[PDB]
Amino acid sequence: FSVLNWDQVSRLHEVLTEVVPIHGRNFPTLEITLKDIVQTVRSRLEEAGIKVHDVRLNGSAAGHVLVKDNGLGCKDLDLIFHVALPTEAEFQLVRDVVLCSLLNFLPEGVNKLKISPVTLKEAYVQKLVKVCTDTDRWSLISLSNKNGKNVQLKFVDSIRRQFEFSVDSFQIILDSLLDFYHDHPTVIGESMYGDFEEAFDHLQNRLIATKNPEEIRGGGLLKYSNLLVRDFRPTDQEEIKTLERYMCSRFFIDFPDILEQQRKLETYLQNHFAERSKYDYLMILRRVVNESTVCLMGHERRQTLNLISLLALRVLAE
C-alpha cells in the first residue's frame, strides 16, 4: 500500500525504454525495447482468450528503480503477468504467444516465415521453466544473455513464495503507465515481505531480514552470501546464527550429493560474477558454513568445506 513518486517513475521510463540486444546462436541479433515486448505479448494473450490481470516489473529491475544505486546488479529484468492457467494447452499456447510476438523483428522477417517455432527457439530462448504442481503453477521464458542481461517473462497463475530476502521482494505494478500510453500517473509498488515500509527501509539501508525461513529453497544460502559480499548486514543477532544454521540445514537437504553441490556452486559463480570477486564470495561461504554448523553434522560439512576450499584454490590458480 505505497505509491511511487517522480523520483522512481523517471527510472521506470528509463528501464522500460532501455534498448536490449538479444544475441543469436547463425541467427542475427535482435534489438528490442521492454515496453514493446510487454505490449506485443499482452496483445497476443488477449487475442487468445486469456485474462491478463496484472502486469508487473520484478527482480533487480524493481530493486534498482526504487533506489538509484543500492548495489545489487541490474542483472534480472523480470516481468510477471498474473494469468489464468488451468489446462496444459494454456502453457503450450503461451509459448506460441511469446514466439509469435518474437517473430516481428526483422525486415526479411516474414520473408522467413518458413522457420519453425522450435527452430526460432534455438537462438532466442535461453532458460525455459514450467511448473504445474499442486501448489505452484507458472511458466518462465528467459532470453539470451550475451552483451546485455537476461530478460525473463514469467506468467504466473499461483505461486506460493516469490521473494528471496527483504531487499528483493519489490514489484512495480505496471497497469498504470501501461494504460498511460510531471507527466506521470499513480504507479503502485508492493513488497512480497508484507508491510512495505519496513522492507523499503531494509533496501535503502542495506539490511537483511525475512520472517519466512521455513519456505526457502535450499539455495537461499547462496544469495545470503551474495548479499554479504556486496555489504549487507542483518538486523537481530538474536536470530542470525539460528538463521544461518537453518539455511545450511536446508542446503544439505536440497543438495545431498557432492557433485550437485559442486554443480550449483560452479553454475552460480559463472552466472552471477562478471568482473576474481569469486574468491571473496567463496571466503564468505567458507566462513558462513564453518561457523554456522551443528557439531553433530561432522563430515556432511567437512566434504562441503573441502569442496569450497578446492573451488577457491582453483579460482586463485586462474
Partner: protein
C-alpha cells in the same frame, strides 16, 4: 480418464540404490531415494540420453528435463540443465504416463525383492518383503526347501527340485501330510512377521525418528 486409476504413485522409501539398463530406458533408484528414468538413443554407435524423468520417493513430484543431440550416457544420471518442468502426480500430462510407468513397475519389482523383516526360526529363515500391502513372504528352510508366498501364487520348491504352485486353499489343504506342516510353519512365521510389522510401524509413527525398518531377528543355528 485419469492417471491415478492406472497406477498408484511409486513408493521408493527404504530402498537400496540400484541401476538397471533396459533396451529403451535406464532406470535408477538414486541414492537419495529419488527414482530416475532416462531415455536413450543409439546414434553414431554411441548412446545418448534424450530426456530424463526424476521422481520423488512419494511418487508425487515429476521433474522432466531435456538437454540441448543431447547427453552422453553417464553411469549416474545427468544433472538437470535449464529446460526443466515440474509436475505433480495427477497433473502429469498423458505424454509421460508410460515413462513414469517404467519407473513405477521397476520400484514395485524392487519392493518385492527387498527384505523388511528377516526372522530366523528353528527350522527356516523368513523374509517379509517391502511391497506392502499384500507383502511377498519368502521362507528359506535350512532343510533346502523353499516356500514363496505371493498375493495368490504360492510356489513350493521341495528338496528334490519339484516345484508346484498353490492357488486356492482347495489346493492347499490337499497337500500330503509332509508339506502340510511346512505350510503350517511358514503360515505361523508370516503371522509373526506381519504382527511385528504392524507393531513396530506404529511405534515408528509415534517416535518419528531414524527408520525402524529393515529389521533382522535371530541367528542361523
Amino acid at each position: 480418464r485419469t492417471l491415478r486409476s492406472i497406477t498408484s504413485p511409486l513408493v521408493a522409501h527404504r530402498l537400496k540404490p540400484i541401476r538397471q539398463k533396459t533396451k529403451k530406458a535406464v532406470v535408477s533408484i538414486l541414492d537419495s531415494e529419488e527414482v530416475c528414468v532416462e531415455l536413450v538413443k543409439e546414434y553414431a554407435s554411441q548412446e545418448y540420453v534424450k530426456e530424463v524423468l526424476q521422481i520423488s520417493s512419494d511418487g508425487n513430484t515429476i521433474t522432466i528435463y531435456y538437454p540441448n543431440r543431447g547427453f552422453p550416457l553417464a553411469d549416474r544420471p545427468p544433472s538437470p540443465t535449464d529446460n526443466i518442468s515440474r509436475y505433480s502426480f495427477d497433473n502429469l500430462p498423458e505424454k509421460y504416463w508410460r515413462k513414469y510407468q517404467y519407473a513405477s513397475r521397476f520400484v514395485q519389482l524392487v519392493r518385492s525383492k527387498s527384505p523388511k523383516i528377516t526372522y530366523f526360526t528353528r527350522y527356516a529363515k523368513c523374509i517379509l518383503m517391502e511391497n506392502s500391502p499384500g507383502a511377498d513372504f519368502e521362507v528359506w528352510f535350512y532343510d533346502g526347501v523353499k516356500i514363496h508366498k505371493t498375493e495368490d501364487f504360492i510356489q513350493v520348491i521341495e528338496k528334490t527340485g519339484k516345484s508346484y504352485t498353490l492357488k486356492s486353499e482347495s489346493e492347499v489343504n490337499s497337500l500330503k501330510e509332509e508339506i502340510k506342516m511346512y505350510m503350517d510353519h511358514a503360515n505361523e512365521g508370516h503371522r509373526i512377521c506381519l504382527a511385528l510389522e504392524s507393531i513396530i510401524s506404529e511405534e515408528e509413527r509415534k517416535t518419528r525418528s531414524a527408520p525402524f525398518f529393515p529389521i533382522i531377528i535371530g541367528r542361523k543355528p
